[PDB]
């Protein structure tokens, strides 16, 4: 528990609503599995049980706030920003044709929850489209992800 400033409860609160589908005040097997599904994986039902049981200290079948912080305090794992670099490409390149297709990008919105219109879908593409080839190459992808 390295979080002693109030401000941090404030931050954590917002975070809770991120996975709380039914805002029941508890994390359940249903909402757990939905979010992972978004990760592009097809976990089996038994996965919901095995995973929840491991974190569920009180054996009540769900994860509450106290059980939440314990993990957050020890969840300081260092992810090399590179881990998501190459991997993020494979997801976008659905058919692995060596290029990022517009149809493939469209699905990305759904994951981020941007609910972009046709206009904005085309707009983003223009930004990376250094040439009127109508497709986004690996080089263009990097230029855009070159944030920090």
């Amino acid at each position: 528990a390295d979080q002693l400033t109030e401000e941090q409860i404030a931050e954590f609160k917002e975070a809770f609503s991120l996975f709380d589908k039914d805002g029941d005040g508890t994390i359940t097997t249903k909402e757990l599995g939905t979010v992972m599904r978004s990760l592009g994986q097809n976990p089996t039902e038994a996965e919901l049980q095995d995973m929840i049981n491991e974190v569920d200290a009180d054996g009540n079948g769900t994860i509450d706030f106290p059980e939440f912080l314990t993990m957050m305090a020890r969840k300081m794992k260092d992810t090399d920003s590179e881990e998501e670099i190459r991997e993020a490409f494979r997801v976008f390149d659905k058919d692995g044709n060596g290029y990022i297709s517009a149809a493939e990008l469209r699905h990305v919105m759904t994951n981020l929850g941007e609910k972009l219109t046709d206009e904005e879908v085309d707009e983003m593409i223009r930004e990376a489209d250094i040439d009127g080839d109508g497709q986004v190459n690996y080089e263009e992808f990097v230029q855009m992800m070159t944030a920090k």
């Binding site: 990760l39 995973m51 992810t79 920003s81 998501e84 993020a88 981020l112 983003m124 070159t146 944030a147």
Partner: peptide, 28 residues
């Protein structure tokens, strides 16, 4: 658009988190 970094990048940032939560469950 200038500074198109915000639009593109924003989404990248969330994905890092996506799996930050679950890693706790798996434990490597």
């Amino acid at each position: 658009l200038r500074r198109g970094q915000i639009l593109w990048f924003r989404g990248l940032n969330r994905i890092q988190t996506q799996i930050k939560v679950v890693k706790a469950f798996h434990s490597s």
